[PDB]
mmCIF file of C-alpha atoms and ligand atoms in Angstrom:
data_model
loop_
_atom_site.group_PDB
_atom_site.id
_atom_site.type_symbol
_atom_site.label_atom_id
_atom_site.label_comp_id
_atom_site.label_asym_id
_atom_site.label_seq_id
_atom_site.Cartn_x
_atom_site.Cartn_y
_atom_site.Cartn_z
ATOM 1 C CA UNK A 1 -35.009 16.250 78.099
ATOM 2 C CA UNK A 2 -37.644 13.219 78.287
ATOM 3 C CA UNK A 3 -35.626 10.521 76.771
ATOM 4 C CA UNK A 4 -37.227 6.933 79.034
ATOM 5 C CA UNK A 5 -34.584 5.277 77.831
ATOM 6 C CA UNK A 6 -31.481 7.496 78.156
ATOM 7 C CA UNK A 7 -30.712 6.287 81.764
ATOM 8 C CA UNK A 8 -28.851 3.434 80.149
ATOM 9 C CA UNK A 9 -26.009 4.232 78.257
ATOM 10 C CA UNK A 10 -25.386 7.290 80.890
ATOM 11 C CA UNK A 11 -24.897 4.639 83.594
ATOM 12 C CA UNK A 12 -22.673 2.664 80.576
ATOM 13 C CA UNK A 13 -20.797 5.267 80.668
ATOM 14 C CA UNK A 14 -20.826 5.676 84.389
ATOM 15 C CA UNK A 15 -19.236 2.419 84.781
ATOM 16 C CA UNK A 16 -16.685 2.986 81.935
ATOM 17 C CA UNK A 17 -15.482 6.268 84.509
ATOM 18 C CA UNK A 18 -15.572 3.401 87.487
ATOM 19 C CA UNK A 19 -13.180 1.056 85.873
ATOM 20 C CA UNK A 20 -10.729 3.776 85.716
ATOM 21 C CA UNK A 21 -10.738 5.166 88.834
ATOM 22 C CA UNK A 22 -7.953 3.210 91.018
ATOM 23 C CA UNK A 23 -10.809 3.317 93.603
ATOM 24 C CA UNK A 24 -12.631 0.712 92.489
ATOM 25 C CA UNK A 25 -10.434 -2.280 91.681
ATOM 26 C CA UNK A 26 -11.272 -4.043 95.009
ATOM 27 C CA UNK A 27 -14.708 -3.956 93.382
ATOM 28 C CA UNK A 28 -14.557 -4.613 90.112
ATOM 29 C CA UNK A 29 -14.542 -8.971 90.306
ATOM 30 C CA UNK A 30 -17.181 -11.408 92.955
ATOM 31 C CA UNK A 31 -14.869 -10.849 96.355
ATOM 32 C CA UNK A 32 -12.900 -14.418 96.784
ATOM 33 C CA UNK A 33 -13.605 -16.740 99.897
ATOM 34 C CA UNK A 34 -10.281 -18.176 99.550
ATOM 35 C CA UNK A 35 -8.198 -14.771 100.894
ATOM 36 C CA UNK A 36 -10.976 -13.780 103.204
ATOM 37 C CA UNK A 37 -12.637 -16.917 104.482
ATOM 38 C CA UNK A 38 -15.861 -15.685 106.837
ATOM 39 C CA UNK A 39 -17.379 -13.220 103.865
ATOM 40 C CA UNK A 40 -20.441 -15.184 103.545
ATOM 41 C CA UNK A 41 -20.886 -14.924 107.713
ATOM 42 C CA UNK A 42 -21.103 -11.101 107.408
ATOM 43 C CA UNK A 43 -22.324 -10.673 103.820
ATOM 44 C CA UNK A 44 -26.017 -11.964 103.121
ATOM 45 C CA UNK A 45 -25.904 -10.483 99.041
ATOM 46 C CA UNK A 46 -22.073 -9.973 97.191
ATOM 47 C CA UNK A 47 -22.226 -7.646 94.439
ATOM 48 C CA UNK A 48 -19.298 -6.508 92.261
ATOM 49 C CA UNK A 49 -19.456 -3.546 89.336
ATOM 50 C CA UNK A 50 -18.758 -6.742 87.043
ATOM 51 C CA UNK A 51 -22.257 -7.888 87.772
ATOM 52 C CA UNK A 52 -23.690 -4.921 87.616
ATOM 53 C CA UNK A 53 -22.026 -4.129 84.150
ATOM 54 C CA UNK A 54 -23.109 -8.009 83.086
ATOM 55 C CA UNK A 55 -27.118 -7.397 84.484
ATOM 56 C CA UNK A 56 -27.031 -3.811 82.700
ATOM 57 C CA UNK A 57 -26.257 -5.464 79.420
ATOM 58 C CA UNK A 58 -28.814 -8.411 79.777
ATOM 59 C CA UNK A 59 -31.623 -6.059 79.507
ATOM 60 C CA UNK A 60 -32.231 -6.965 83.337
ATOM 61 C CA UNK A 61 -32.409 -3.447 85.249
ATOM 62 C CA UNK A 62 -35.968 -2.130 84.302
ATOM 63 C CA UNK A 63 -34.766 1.656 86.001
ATOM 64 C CA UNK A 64 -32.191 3.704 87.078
ATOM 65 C CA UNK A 65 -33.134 3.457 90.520
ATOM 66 C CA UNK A 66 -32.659 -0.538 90.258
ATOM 67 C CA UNK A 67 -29.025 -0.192 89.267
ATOM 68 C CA UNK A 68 -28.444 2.184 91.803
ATOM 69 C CA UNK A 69 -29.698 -0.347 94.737
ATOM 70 C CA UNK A 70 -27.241 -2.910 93.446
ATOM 71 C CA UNK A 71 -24.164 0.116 92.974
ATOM 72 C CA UNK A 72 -24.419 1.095 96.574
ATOM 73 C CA UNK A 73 -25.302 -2.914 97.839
ATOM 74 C CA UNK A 74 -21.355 -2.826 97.281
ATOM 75 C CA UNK A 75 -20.529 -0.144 99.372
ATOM 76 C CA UNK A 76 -22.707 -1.035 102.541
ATOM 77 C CA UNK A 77 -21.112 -4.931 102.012
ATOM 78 C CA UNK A 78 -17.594 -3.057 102.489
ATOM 79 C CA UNK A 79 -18.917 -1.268 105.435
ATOM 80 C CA UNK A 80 -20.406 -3.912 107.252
ATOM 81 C CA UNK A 81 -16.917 -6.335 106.401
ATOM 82 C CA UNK A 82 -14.344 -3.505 107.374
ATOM 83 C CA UNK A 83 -12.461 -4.091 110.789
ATOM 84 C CA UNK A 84 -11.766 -0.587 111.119
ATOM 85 C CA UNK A 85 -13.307 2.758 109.188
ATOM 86 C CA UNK A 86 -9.738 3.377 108.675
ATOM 87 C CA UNK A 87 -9.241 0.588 106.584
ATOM 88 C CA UNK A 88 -7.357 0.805 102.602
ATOM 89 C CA UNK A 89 -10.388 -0.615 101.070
ATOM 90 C CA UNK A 90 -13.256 0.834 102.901
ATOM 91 C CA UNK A 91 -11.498 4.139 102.237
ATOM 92 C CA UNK A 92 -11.355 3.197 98.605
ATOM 93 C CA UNK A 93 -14.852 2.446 99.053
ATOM 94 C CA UNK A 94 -15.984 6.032 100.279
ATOM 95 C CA UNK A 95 -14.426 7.974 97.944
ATOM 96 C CA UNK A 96 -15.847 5.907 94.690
ATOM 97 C CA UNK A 97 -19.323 5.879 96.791
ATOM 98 C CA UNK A 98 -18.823 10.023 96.433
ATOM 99 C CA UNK A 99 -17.975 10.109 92.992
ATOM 100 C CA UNK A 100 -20.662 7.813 91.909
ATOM 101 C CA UNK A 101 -23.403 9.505 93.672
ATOM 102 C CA UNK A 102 -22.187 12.807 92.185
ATOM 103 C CA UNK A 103 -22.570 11.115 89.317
ATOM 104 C CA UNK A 104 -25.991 9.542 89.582
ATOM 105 C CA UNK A 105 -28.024 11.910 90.539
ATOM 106 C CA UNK A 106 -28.330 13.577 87.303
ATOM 107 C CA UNK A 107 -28.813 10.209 85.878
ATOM 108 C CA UNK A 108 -32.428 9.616 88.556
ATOM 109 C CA UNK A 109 -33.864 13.181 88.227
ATOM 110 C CA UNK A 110 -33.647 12.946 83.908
ATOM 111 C CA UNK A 111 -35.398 9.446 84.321
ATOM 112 C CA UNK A 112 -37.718 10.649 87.129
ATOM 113 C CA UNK A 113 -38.662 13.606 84.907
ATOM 114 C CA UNK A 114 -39.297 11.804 81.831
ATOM 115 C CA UNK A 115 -41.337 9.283 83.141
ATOM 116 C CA UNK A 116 -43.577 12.114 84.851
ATOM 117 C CA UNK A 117 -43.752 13.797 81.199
ATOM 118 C CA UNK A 118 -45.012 10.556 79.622
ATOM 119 C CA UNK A 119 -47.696 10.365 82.478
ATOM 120 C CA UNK A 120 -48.766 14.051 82.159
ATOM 121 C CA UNK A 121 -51.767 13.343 80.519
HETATM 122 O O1 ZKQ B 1 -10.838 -9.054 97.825
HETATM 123 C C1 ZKQ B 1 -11.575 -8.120 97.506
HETATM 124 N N1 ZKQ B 1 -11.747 -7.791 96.186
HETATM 125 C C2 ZKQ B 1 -10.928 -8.305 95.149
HETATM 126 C C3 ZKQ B 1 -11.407 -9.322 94.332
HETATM 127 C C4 ZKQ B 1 -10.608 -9.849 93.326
HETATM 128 C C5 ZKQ B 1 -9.333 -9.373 93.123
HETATM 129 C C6 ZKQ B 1 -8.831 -8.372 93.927
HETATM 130 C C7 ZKQ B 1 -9.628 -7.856 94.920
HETATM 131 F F1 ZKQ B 1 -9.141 -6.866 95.712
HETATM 132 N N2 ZKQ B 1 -12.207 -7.364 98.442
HETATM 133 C C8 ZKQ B 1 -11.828 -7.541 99.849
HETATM 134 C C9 ZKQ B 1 -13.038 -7.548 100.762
HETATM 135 N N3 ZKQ B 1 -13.824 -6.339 100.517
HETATM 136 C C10 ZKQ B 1 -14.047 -5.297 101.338
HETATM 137 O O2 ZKQ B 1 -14.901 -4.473 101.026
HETATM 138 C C11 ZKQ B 1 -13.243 -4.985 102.511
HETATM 139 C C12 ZKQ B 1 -13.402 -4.011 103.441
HETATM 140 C C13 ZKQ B 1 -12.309 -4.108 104.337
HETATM 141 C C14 ZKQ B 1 -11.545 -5.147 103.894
HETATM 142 O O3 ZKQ B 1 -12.101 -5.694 102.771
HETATM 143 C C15 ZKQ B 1 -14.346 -6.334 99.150
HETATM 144 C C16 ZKQ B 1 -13.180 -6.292 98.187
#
């Protein structure tokens, strides 16, 4: 299966299944300074599965691996902002971080492989 350029509708798609899950609507928009006024104190580099959708589309991820850095930037910003690991939207945020990584995986090793077949000679 040693499709280079398969990676990117499969993480289209991936996103389409992250839009519907309840999970991620905390995530799905730039988080707003206005309700919680210190996020730039804790959070060096927002992200949001908007952005990621948006730089996915522009041509602008060169891998899978790429959009997978920026994916799972937005689960270590909710960790470092929660106040508690019992929190609504950290919670929120471990659960999609499951589902997405069950997801992915399949996504890295097809790349992974098919840029090792182009190379093989
Ligand atoms: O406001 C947020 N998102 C949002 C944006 C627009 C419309 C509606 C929305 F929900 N947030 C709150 C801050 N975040 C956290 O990860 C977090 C962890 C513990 C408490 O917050 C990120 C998502």
């Amino acid at each position: 299966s040693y499709d280079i350029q398969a990676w990117k509708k499969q993480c289209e798609e991936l996103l389409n299944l992250i839009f519907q899950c309840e999970d991620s609507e905390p995530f799905r928009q730039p988080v707003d300074l206005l309700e919680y006024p210190d996020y730039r104190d804790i959070i060096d580099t927002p992200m949001d599965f908007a952005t990621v959708r948006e730089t996915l589309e522009a041509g602008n991820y060169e891998s899978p691996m790429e959009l997978c850095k920026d994916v799972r930037l937005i689960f270590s910003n909710s960790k470092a902002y929660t106040p508690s690991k019992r929190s609504r939207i950290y919670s929120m945020s471990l659960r999609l971080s499951a589902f997405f990584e069950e997801h992915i995986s399949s996504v890295l090793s097809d790349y992974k492989s098919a840029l090792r077949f182009h190379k093989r000679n």
